[PDB]
UniProtKB/Swiss-Prot annotation:
A cellular component annotation (GO) from this entry: nucleoplasm
Stretches that traverse the bilayer: none
UniProt entry keywords in alphabetical sequence: Acetylation, ATP-binding, Cytoplasm, Ligase, Mitochondrion, Nucleotide-binding, Nucleus, Phosphoprotein, Repeat, Ubl conjugation, Ubl conjugation pathway
N6-acetyllysine modifications at: K43
Lineage, highest ranks first: Eukaryota, Metazoa, Chordata, Craniata, Vertebrata
Record-annotated active site: C4 (glycyl thioester intermediate)
Phosphothreonine, modified sites: T172
GO MF assignments: ATP binding; ubiquitin activating enzyme activity
Subunit structure: Monomer. Interacts with GAN (via BTB domain).
Record's protein name: Ubiquitin-like modifier-activating enzyme 1
Compartment(s) where it occurs, according to its Swiss-Prot or TrEMBL record: Cytoplasm; Mitochondrion; Nucleus
Function: Catalyzes the first step in ubiquitin conjugation to mark cellular proteins for degradation through the ubiquitin-proteasome system. Activates ubiquitin by first adenylating its C-terminal glycine residue with ATP, and thereafter linking this residue to the side chain of a cysteine residue in E1, yielding a ubiquitin-E1 thioester and free AMP. Essential for the formation of radiation-induced foci, timely DNA repair and for response to replication stress. Promotes the recruitment of TP53BP1 and BRCA1 at DNA damage sites.
Length: 255
């Protein structure tokens, strides 16, 4: 499936669910895995650095972000993180896309850009009393907690209460953001060098480790499908795509 359709222009629940699975990997498995490796070899800073064009920074910064910026100390930190991520995916990034391609954007041929296999999205507004919204935080925060070896909670009332005190950084769409429309892909070594002197030294973080999570669609006692269904239906709501319940989702999730 075209990347750009997955990333920016979904039009079917299957695109949404695929995206949700991708999200699960990028949030609860990859970060932890790289972070563990970084804390194991030296061959990591180097090996990773010998990687294809843009990846080096991407990776090295996730590590930085996983070891310092977002490293949680408390369950409330996890709940906060989830709420912030929810805003990033169902609000900020949407507003950014609409910035690069306004609802009334036309093609060079004079046609509407947002037409046909494309659905123009709209940003969501967080609401604790919205089951879907809460479903998402509950699942994401718990999975996020696990990733750091923290105990989570299934107390919806408690999380709802903690959320009342969570403040979201304001967001504003930037100018030079590349959002590809076709599978046509095209500050490089100084941003990179900055990290090399920034990334804490393994020995400066005694016995710190992360717990990568392998996706298991079958264990209903997980939050795995809870996440997939929530992450997916929220994205679907961005793009005016009809939601799929847990059952249809796992059924349409033969993918």
């Amino acid at each position: 499936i075209p990347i750009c359709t997955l990333k920016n222009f979904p039009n079917a629940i299957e695109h949404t669910l695929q995206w949700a699975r991708d999200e699960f990997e990028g949030l609860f498995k990859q970060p932890a895995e790289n972070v563990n490796q970084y804390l194991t070899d030296s061959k990591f800073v180097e090996r990773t650095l010998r990687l294809a064009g843009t990846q080096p920074l991407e990776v090295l910064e996730a590590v930085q972000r996983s070891l310092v910026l977002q490293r949680p100390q408390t369950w409330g930190d996890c709940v906060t993180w989830a709420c912030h991520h929810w805003h990033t995916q169902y609000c900020n990034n949407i507003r950014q896309l609409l910035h690069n391609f306004p609802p009334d954007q036309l093609t060079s041929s004079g046609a509407p850009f947002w037409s046909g296999p494309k659905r123009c999205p709209h940003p969501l507004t967080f609401d604790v009393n919205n089951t879907l919204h809460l479903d998402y935080v509950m699942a994401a925060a718990n999975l996020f907690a696990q990733t750091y070896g923290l105990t989570g909670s299934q107390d919806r009332a408690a999380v709802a209460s903690l959320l009342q005190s969570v403040q979201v950084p304001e967001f504003t769409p930037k100018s030079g953001v590349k959002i590809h429309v076709s599978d046509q892909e095209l500050v490089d070594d100084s941003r990179l060098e900055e990290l090399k002197a920034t990334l804490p030294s393994p020995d400066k973080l005694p016995g710190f480790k992360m717990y990568p999570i392998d996706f298991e669609k079958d264990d209903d006692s997980n939050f795995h499908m809870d996440f997939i269904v929530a992450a997916s239906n929220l994205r679907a709501e961005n793009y005016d795509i009809s939601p799929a319940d847990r059952h249809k989702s796992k059924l349409i999730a033969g993918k």
